[PDB]
GROMACS .gro file of C-alpha atoms in nm:
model
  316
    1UNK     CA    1   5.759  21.833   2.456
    2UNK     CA    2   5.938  21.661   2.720
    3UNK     CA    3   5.984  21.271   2.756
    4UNK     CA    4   5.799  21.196   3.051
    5UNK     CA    5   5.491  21.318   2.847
    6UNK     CA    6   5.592  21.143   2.567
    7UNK     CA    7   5.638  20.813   2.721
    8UNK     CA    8   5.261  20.835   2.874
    9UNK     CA    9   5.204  20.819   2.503
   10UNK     CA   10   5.296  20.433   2.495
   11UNK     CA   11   5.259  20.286   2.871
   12UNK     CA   12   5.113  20.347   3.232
   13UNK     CA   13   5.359  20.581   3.452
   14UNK     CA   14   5.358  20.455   3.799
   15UNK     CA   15   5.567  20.619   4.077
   16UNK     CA   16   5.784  20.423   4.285
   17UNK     CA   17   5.768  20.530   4.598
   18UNK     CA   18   5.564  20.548   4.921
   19UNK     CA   19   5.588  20.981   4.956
   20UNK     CA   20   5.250  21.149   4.877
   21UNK     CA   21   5.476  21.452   4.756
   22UNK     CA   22   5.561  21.242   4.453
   23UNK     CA   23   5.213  21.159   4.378
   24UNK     CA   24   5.092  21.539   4.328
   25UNK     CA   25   5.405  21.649   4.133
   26UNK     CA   26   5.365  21.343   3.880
   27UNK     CA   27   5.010  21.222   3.850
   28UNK     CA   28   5.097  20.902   3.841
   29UNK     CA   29   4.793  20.594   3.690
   30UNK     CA   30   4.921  20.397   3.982
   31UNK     CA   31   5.156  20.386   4.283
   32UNK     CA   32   5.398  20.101   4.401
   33UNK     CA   33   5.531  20.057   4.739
   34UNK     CA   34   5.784  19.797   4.939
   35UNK     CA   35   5.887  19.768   5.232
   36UNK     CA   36   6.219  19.935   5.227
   37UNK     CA   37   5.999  20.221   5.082
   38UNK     CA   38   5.750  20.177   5.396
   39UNK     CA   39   6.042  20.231   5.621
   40UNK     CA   40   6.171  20.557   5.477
   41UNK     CA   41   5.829  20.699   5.442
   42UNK     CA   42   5.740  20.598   5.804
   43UNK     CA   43   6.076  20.813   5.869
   44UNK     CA   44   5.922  21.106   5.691
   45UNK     CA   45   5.809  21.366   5.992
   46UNK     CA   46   5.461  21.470   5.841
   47UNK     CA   47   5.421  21.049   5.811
   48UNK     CA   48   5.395  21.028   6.225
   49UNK     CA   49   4.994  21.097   6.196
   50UNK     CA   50   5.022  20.788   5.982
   51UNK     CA   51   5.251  20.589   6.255
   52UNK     CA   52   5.042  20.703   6.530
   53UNK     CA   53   4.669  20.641   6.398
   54UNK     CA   54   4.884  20.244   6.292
   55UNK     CA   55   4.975  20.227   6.682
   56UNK     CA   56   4.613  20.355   6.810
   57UNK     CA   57   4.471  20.085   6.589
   58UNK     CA   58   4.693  19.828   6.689
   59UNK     CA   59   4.622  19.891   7.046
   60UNK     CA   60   4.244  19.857   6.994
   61UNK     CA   61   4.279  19.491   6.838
   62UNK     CA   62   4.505  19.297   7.149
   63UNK     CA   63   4.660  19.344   7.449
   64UNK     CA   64   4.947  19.114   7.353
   65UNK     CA   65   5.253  19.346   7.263
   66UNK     CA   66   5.426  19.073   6.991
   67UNK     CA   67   5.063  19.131   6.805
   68UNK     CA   68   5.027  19.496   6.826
   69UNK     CA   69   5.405  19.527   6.657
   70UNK     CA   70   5.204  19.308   6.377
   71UNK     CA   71   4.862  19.470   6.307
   72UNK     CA   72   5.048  19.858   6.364
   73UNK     CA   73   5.288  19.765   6.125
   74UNK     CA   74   4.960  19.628   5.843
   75UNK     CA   75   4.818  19.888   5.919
   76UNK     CA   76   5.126  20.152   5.851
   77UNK     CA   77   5.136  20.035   5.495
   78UNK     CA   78   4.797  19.991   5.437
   79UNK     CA   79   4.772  20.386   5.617
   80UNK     CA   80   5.027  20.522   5.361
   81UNK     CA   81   4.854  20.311   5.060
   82UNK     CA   82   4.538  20.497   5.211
   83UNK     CA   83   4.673  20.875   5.167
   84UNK     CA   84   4.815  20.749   4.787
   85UNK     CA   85   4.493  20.632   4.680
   86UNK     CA   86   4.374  20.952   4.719
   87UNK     CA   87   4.563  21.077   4.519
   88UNK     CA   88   4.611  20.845   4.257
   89UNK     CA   89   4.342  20.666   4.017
   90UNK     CA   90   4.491  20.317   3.982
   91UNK     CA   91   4.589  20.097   4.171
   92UNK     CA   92   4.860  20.060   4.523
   93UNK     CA   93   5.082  19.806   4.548
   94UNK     CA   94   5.168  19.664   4.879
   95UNK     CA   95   5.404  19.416   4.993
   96UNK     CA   96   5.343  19.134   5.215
   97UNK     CA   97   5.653  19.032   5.497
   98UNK     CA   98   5.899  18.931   5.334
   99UNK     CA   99   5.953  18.636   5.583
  100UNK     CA  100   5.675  18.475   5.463
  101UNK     CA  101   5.854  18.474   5.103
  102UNK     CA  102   5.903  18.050   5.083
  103UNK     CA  103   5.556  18.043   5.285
  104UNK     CA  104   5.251  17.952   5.066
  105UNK     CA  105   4.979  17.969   5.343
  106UNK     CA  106   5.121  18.232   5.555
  107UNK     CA  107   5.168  18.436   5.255
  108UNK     CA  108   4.782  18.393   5.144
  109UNK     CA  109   4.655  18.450   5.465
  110UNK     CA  110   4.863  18.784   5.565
  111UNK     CA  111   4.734  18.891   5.129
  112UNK     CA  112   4.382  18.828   5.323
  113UNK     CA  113   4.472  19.031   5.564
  114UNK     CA  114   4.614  19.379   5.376
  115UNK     CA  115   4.292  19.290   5.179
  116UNK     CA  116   4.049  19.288   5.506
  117UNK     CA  117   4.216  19.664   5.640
  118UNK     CA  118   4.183  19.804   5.293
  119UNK     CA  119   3.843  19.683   5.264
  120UNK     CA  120   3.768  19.793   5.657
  121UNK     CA  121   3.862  20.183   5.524
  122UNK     CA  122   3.641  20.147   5.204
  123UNK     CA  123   3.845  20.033   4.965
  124UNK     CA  124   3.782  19.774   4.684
  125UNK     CA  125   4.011  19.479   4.530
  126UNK     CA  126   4.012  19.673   4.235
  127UNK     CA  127   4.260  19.915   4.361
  128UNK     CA  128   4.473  19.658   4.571
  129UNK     CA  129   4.782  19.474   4.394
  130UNK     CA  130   4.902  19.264   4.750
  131UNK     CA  131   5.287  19.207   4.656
  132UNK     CA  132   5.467  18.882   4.647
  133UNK     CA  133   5.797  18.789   4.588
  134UNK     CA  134   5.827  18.580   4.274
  135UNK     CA  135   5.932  18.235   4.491
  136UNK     CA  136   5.747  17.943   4.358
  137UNK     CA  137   5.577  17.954   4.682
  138UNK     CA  138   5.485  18.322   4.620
  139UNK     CA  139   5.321  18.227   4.282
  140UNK     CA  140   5.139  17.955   4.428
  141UNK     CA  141   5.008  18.193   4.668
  142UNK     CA  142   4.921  18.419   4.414
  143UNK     CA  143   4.724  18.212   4.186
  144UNK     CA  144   4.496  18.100   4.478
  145UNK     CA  145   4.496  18.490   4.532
  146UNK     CA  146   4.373  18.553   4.217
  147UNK     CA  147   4.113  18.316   4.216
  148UNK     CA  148   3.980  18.436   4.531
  149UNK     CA  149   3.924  18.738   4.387
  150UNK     CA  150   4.256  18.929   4.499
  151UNK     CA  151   4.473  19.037   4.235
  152UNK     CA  152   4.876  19.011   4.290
  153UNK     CA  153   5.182  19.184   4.160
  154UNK     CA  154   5.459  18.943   4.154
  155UNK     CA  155   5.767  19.152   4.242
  156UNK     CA  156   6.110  19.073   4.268
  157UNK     CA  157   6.113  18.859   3.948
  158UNK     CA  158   6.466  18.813   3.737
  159UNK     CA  159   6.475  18.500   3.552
  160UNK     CA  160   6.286  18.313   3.294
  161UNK     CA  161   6.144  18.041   3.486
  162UNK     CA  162   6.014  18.291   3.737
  163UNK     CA  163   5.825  18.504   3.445
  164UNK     CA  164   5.722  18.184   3.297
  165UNK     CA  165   5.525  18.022   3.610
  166UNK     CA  166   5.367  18.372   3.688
  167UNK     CA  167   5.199  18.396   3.318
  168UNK     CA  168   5.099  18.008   3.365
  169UNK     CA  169   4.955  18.129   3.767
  170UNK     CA  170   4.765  18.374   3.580
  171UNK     CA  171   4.858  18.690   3.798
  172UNK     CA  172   4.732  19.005   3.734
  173UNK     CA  173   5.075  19.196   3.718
  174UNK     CA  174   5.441  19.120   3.701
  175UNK     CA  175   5.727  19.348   3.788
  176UNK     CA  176   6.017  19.267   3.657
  177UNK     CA  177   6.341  19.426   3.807
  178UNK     CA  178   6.583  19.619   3.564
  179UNK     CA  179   6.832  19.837   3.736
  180UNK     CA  180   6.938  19.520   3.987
  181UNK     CA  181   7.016  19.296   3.696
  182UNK     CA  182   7.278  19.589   3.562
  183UNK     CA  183   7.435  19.599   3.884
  184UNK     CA  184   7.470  19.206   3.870
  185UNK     CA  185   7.633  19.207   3.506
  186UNK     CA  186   7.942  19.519   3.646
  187UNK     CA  187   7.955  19.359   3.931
  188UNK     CA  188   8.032  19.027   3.805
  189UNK     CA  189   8.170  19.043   3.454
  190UNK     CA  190   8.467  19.275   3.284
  191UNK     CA  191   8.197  19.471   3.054
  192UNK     CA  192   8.064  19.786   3.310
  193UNK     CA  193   7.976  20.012   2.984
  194UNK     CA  194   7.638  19.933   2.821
  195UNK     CA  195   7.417  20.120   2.591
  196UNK     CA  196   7.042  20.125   2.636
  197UNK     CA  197   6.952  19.796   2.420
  198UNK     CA  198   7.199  19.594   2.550
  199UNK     CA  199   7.151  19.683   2.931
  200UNK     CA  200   7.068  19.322   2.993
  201UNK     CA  201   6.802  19.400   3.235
  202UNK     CA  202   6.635  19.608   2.909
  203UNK     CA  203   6.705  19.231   2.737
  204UNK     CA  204   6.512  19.054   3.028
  205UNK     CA  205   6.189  19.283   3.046
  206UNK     CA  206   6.233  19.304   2.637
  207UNK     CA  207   6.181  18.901   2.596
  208UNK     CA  208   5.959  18.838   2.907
  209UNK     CA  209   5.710  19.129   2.731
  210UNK     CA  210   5.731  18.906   2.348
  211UNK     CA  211   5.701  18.600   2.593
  212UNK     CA  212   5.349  18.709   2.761
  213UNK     CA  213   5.228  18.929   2.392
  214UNK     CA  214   5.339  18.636   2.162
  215UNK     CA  215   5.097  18.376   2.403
  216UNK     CA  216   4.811  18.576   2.479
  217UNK     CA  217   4.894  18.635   2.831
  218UNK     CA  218   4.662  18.915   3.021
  219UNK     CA  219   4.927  18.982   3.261
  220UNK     CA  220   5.058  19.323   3.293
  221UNK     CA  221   5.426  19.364   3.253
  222UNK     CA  222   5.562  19.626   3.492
  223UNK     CA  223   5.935  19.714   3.415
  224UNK     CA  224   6.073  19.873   3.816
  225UNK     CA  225   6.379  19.954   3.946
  226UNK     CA  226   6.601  20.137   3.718
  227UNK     CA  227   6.936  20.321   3.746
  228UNK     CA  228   6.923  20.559   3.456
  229UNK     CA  229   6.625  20.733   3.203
  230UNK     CA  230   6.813  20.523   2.928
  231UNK     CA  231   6.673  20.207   3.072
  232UNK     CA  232   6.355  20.349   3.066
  233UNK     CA  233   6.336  20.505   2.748
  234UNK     CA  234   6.445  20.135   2.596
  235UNK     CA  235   6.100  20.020   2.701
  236UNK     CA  236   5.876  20.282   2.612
  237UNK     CA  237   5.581  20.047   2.470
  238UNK     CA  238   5.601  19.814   2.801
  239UNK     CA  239   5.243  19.808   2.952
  240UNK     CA  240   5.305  20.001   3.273
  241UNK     CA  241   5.686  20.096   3.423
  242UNK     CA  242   5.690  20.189   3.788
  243UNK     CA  243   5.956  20.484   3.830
  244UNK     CA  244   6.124  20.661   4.118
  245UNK     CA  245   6.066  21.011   4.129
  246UNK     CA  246   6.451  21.119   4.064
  247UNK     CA  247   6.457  20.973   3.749
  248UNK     CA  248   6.056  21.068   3.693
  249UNK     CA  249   6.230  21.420   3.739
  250UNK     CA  250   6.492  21.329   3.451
  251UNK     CA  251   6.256  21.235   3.208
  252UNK     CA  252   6.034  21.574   3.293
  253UNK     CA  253   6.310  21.785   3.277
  254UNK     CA  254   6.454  21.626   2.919
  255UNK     CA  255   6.325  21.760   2.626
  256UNK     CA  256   6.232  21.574   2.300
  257UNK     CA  257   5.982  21.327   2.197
  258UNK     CA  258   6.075  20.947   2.222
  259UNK     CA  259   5.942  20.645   1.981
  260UNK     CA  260   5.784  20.342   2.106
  261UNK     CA  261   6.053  20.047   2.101
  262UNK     CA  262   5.846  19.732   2.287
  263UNK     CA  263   5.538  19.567   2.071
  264UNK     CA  264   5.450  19.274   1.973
  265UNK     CA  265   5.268  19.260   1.607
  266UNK     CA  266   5.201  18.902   1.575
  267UNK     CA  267   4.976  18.611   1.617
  268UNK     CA  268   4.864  18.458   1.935
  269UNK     CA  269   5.090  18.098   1.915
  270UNK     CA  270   5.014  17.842   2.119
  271UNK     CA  271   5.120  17.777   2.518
  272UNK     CA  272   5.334  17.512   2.606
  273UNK     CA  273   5.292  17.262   2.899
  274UNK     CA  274   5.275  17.429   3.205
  275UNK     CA  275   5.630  17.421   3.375
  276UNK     CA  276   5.634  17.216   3.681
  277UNK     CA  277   5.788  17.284   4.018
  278UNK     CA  278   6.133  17.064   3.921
  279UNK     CA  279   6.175  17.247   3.560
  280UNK     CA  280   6.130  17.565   3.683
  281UNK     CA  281   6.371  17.493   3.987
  282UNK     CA  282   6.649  17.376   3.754
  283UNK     CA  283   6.579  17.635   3.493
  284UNK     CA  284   6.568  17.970   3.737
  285UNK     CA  285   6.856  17.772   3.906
  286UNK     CA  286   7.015  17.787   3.573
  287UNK     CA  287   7.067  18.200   3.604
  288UNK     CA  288   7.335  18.290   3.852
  289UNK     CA  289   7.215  18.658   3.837
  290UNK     CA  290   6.841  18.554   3.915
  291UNK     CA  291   6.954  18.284   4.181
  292UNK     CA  292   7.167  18.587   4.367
  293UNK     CA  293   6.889  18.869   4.341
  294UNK     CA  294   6.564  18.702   4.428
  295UNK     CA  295   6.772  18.580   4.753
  296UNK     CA  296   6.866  18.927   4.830
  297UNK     CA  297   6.567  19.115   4.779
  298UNK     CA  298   6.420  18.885   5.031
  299UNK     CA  299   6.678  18.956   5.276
  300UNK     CA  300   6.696  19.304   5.254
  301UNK     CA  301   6.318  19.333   5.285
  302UNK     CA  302   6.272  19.149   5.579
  303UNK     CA  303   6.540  19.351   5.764
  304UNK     CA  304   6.352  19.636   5.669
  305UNK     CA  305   6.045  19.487   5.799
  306UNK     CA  306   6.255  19.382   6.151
  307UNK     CA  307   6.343  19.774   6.177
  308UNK     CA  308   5.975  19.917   6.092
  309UNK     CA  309   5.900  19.617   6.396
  310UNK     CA  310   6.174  19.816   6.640
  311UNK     CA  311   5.984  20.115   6.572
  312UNK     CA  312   5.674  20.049   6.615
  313UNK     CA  313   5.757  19.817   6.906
  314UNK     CA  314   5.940  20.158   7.024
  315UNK     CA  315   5.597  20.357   7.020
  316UNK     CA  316   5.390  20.076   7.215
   0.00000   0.00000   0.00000
């Protein structure tokens, strides 16, 4: 056997990326998307019927130019989610602005939105996970998601505190980031050698899964971003792991059955308190990684979102 079958054994395979290519080779239960991923896929030649059905939307909602750059650009990523859901039986993931990351209302309103297109081309809630970065104000939004009926997948999440508050916000999925928190520990400590179980983003997802199994949290844990098959293989057992298809090629191509190495065979114990906005300040505050990447991500995302903008804004 090879170990891409064999981890389907023991959790969800998701593919990481926004290219429909990817989603016929692997068969993936579900599909994740951001908006870096957007912006390479909108790149993609075959993707301009995608672009230019966006544009020929946009321009039958307003005449105002600053709002056409705004619904084509929805619409892009809700026209790529589109073509994935077709070929996939789960669920799309798709990310909100990433300017509206430390924006509680704006960030509800433009999940309302994604929600209204997807629902406009026939599509249910069921198959929707609106992304969020995992900002206290994101979570916020996302619990008020949630109880409206639209279900979240808080992205971008590296420390404690963040993983915490999302369990206690009861959102339907968390994805939290492996390969980033590597690149964090070479690039700021001596140590740039580290096998599988101590790859400290393989630590993070390890104790944030015992955190939400050990409390009875329905929450989905979603290990993304990796940087090697190792990282991977450490958390065979994790609910779902979204993958990129490079390394979904690795783990095809390797032969050899793997065992399962994340459960939780215990007792339901009980929750604490919920963590209030000051605790969980201090405590994600507290991780230097965490306090770096979440910034970042942020950042980069809503530069990708300004260049999908000068594209689209180059086609009006």
């Amino acid at each position: 056997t090879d170990k891409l079958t064999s981890l389907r054994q023991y959790t969800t395979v998701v593919a990481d990326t926004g290219d429909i290519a990817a989603m016929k080779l692997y068969q993936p239960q579900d599909a994740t998307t951001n908006p870096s991923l957007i912006l390479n896929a909108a790149q993609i030649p075959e993707y301009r019927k995608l672009i230019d059905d966006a544009v020929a939307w946009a321009k039958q909602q307003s005449n105002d130019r600053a709002q056409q750059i705004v619904d084509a650009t929805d619409k892009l990523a809700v026209n790529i989610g589109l073509e994935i859901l077709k070929l996939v039986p789960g669920r799309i993931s798709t990310e909100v602005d990433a300017r509206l990351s430390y924006d509680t209302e704006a960030s509800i309103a433009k999940a309302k939105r994604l929600i209204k297109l997807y629902n406009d081309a026939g599509i249910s809630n069921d198959r929707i996970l609106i992304k969020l970065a995992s900002t206290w104000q994101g979570i916020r939004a996302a619990e008020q998601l949630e109880k409206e009926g639209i279900n979240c997948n808080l992205t971008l999440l590296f420390s404690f505190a963040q993983a915490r508050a999302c369990a206690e916000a009861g959102v339907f999925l968390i994805s939290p980031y492996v390969g980033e928190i590597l690149d964090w520990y070479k690039a700021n400590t001596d140590k740039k050698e580290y096998a599988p179980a101590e790859d400290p983003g393989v630590v993070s997802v390890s104790e944030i899964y015992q955190y939400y199994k050990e409390h009875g949290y329905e929450t989905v844990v979603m290990g993304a971003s990796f940087r090697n098959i190792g990282e991977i293989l450490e958390l065979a057992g994790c609910d779902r792991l979204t993958i990129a298809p490079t390394l979904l090629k690795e783990l095809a191509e390797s032969e050899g059955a793997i065992e399962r190495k994340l459960s939780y065979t215990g007792e339901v114990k009980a929750r604490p308190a919920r963590i209030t906005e000051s605790e969980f300040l201090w405590q994600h505050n507290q991780d230097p990684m965490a306090v770096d990447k979440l910034a970042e991500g942020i950042r980069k995302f809503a530069i990708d979102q300004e260049k999908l903008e000068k594209m689209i804004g180059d086609l009006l």
